[PDB]
Symmetry: C6
Subunit: 216 residues, 6 copies
């Protein structure tokens, strides 16, 4: 990785942490913030190490590769590399494959990340990887938020847990997700608790809603 800026190899306990999360949690939504945290300051080499050390889930990993390739192609379309001898004082322009670590060396990565102004190829590539992981997570979610409905004897807290767990894995903007919160959560509550929530009125907070249906 790179520490604040000096270069350092990815740590054995970072590597083990990532392998373990994937083995135990598959692509549960919290896997993505864990990936991002484990890869703070990471070069594209480090990111590839993390992705390559995953054993199994090879369908997912190959979908990830496809997403990265799509983003790399769009990068090249927006940022064409010009043919010409690079002058002594300078470094070259990164291609999609350079951002993904496939056609760049560590030194070239290091060069872009530390050169002023910074070309932050690790952060750009991590974005692409996260875009791919989001697709995988939505793939691994069996359920739609529209199907999260409160059970007849289900405590409201348990329903809310299921609701927001599902909502986390939905492909939707924050605007769409806000609409799902403000719409579906109350609509799909069970008859007894729903009646109580309506009497609170339409601008009550989640704390107040959860406390309201605690007795029932």
């Amino acid at each position: 990785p790179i520490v604040q800026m000096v270069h350092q190899a990815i740590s054995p306990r970072t590597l083990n942490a990532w392998v373990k999360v994937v083995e135990e949690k598959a692509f549960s939504p919290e896997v993505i913030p864990m990936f991002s945290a484990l890869s703070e300051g990471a070069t594209p080499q480090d990111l590839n190490t993390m992705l390559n050390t995953v054993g199994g889930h090879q369908a997912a990993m190959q979908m990830l590769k496809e997403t990265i390739n799509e983003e790399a192609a769009e990068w090249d379309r927006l940022h064409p590399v010009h043919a010409g001898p690079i002058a002594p004082g300078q470094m070259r322009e990164p291609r999609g494959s350079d951002i993904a670590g496939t056609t760049s060396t560590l030194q070239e990565q290091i060069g872009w990340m530390t050169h002023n102004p910074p070309i932050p190829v690790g952060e750009i590539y991590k974005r692409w990887i996260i875009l791919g992981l989001n697709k995988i997570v939505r793939m691994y979610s069996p359920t739609s938020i529209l199907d999260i409905r409160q059970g007849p004897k289900e405590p409201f807290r348990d329903y809310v847990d299921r609701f927001y767990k599902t909502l986390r894995a939905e492909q939707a903007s924050q605007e769409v997700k806000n609409w799902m919160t403000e719409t579906l959560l109350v609509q799909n509550a069970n008859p007894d608790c729903k009646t109580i929530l309506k009497a609170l009125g339409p601008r009550a907070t989640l704390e107040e809603m959860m406390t309201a249906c605690q007795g029932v």
Copy 2:
């Protein structure tokens, strides 16, 4: 985080510690001092990492988000950002969303935390998060301090353990909590030990009270 002041990514063993505490203890009161200790010097990015890596308890986590949003809105009301080009020597004013790490970069956070005088957005955001966790803890407590009563054969030490465990999760100021100590603890003691505590008089220390009812 930031070490005393140089920037450092949140550690794999810090991240694992937090995930584990939440899995094993849910929102027992001691979870909050653990959160605070694990997040010493933390940037808002680090704090969000910690909150985002929690799997399950999604009702709680969404209540936390609501509390943060309320505090962010109050920040903006008190501290309005002015429209204008930021001069070269300066950095901009943080909004609520900048404190919460949602609209700021690590570099902007770092800039505020290290610039003189310091704008300590990590410490401000940690406060908001703790305010949210307090609500969650009180939610997760099933019991009121008013219902902690000594059992007929319960050793006094066991009663005191239950009393202060419950008291820790109460929403009350230190003044209200002092009143609960000075009032309820003796009043809700069992008949035999209560008689003994009254004969000690009204300004005896907890050590003396606990020793007094050791034989009984």
Copy 3:
């Protein structure tokens, strides 16, 4: 903590070590030297973190708080804070609550600990905490040193183990404890071994005593 002098957050493995000791050993006497070792160089914030992260034993923890409050009050009586504007070059006088970390910031603590001459508020507060833990340990000891008597078939080494274990938890000065060693250990030995120890004479070392009763 503070390393020799640069400031550093309390470590995840220090925090975990303390939590684990308390869970597994309660307030066995060796818990106190472990606390002291884990808190080397600690600021009052670090000490409070350690105390606050203990789950359960809330009667003990509240007794600890009482002892700290007593020591804080005595500090204020001996060292009154004077009302007045602190000049630019200086820092203010710590109150009892500043030593306990309740009314001070980390920076103020850091200021006192590093300023020349040093006001070592971490070491002062750790003393108060240890005074409180001693009371707890004596509370958790069921037994008095006067009741440690050698069994009819108990190997002398086993008796000596029980004797010094109990003696460790006694509230007594070193003079009182010396008297208990020189008096009770031989007096409460079993008839056969006691006869043998008297024939050694009255100034023989523990090694010699233990070897003398090895055959018997």
Copy 4:
């Protein structure tokens, strides 16, 4: 290893990580990216330590030695060492055996890796080792990609997992591997899902293919 450039002995937790991976996973394909990650910045001494600390799999390890010897011989053929006294300011040319760490000292390795321009003998040797590990991995794979066929009731995601797992261990260029993807994956799908994939057309992405056969 070497940290960015200061020399450091290979760490106990790096060493243990490597031993453990090999014990648990044998030569599953992900073992190679793990080896590469654990050996970032490694000198030939470190690489030999890692290879020598593997217990069992001695047939594999001896095949690895053969591959290294072949690459060393080709190095010497391309880069002949010249007989002559090395002048004071300079260091000597590495032979195949110097790259493999067998006839060089740590200081000589260090000298080549840090001297300007760098002779990166650790990176060159790691390449040779990886070439050997690839042969071992292909040896340990029982199956050919041509024999990965979807079962009559096998969910498509499970078939894709088996397909890319097998493909990872194949000796084939990226061009050959692309042909296997674009050819075999669809051809060896089961009758029901194959019909559905053809109706998508011939330039649909893996995400779309996997979603298409989710119901079936």
Copy 5:
């Protein structure tokens, strides 16, 4: 401890290592080299921490205290402290109790250990502690080297293992121990192997002796 020379608190994993060794191995001879290794560079405070964190074995620990007190008294007899005001540039002379960490501060220890020429109170105290541990080890050994005799069907390697294990815990100089090796090992061998060892002659090495009795 002190690192080469900057001061550092004793580490949580050092502390845990020591506690664990004692719990699991009691005072097996290898406990002493482990103690010495864990305490490299240790101040008397660190050494006391290690000794104080041992739970149980209180008879042993009290014998250790007696040995330390004896060595402290002999120190004072050889090195009397002179009464007088210590001049500004200087530090004072350590007493026995200062070496044992009982009447000195960390700063005083640090002062002696780092001042030129060094007064190495940590190394001196560690010696005294090891002297005490040796007595404990010999106490915990049930057996004398004179009673280690080869069994009728015991492989010679097993006899030699028992012999040197016992010999390690003996109180004897290297001269006495050499005599026990050169004398007892062959004399206490079983009839068949003893005959074979005599035919080797009297200056054969242990390797040769052990190989000689491998078939028998």
Copy 6:
């Protein structure tokens, strides 16, 4: 140890690693490369710590001591220490016992290892120790390479694993070992696979041999 060159105590996790390897693997051949890796940069004190912390295998450990003593004696014969006052600017010549850490201090070791030109007593002593461990390993091997013969139904890969495992523990030069490879491996193969290997011809690589007998 010594880090590249600053002195550092041997780490708790290094110490634990060594103890564990010996407990679990005894003197399997891979124990020696592990010892060497764990002792990178080690002073003779560190090496002795490692050897002394081994519990059990005391016959082996005493054989190790004999080998070290033999090498020390040969050192003294080749390098006689001269009697005379060492001048201020200089340090003295190491004896055999100084290399083994028995008659030298850490400072003297440090002095030799860091003085220019370096007298690398840690590396010299580690050599002697490895010579001793080799003897132990050959002692612990029950089997001769001449007795490794392929079973009638044993897969060739399993035979090759046994062959090279045994070969690793043989006392033989690389020339003798090459002869054993080129001679015994094919000669001791089972009738069916042997016939197939001869038809490959006499200069085929191990990969090709192992693949040839995969079907059979």
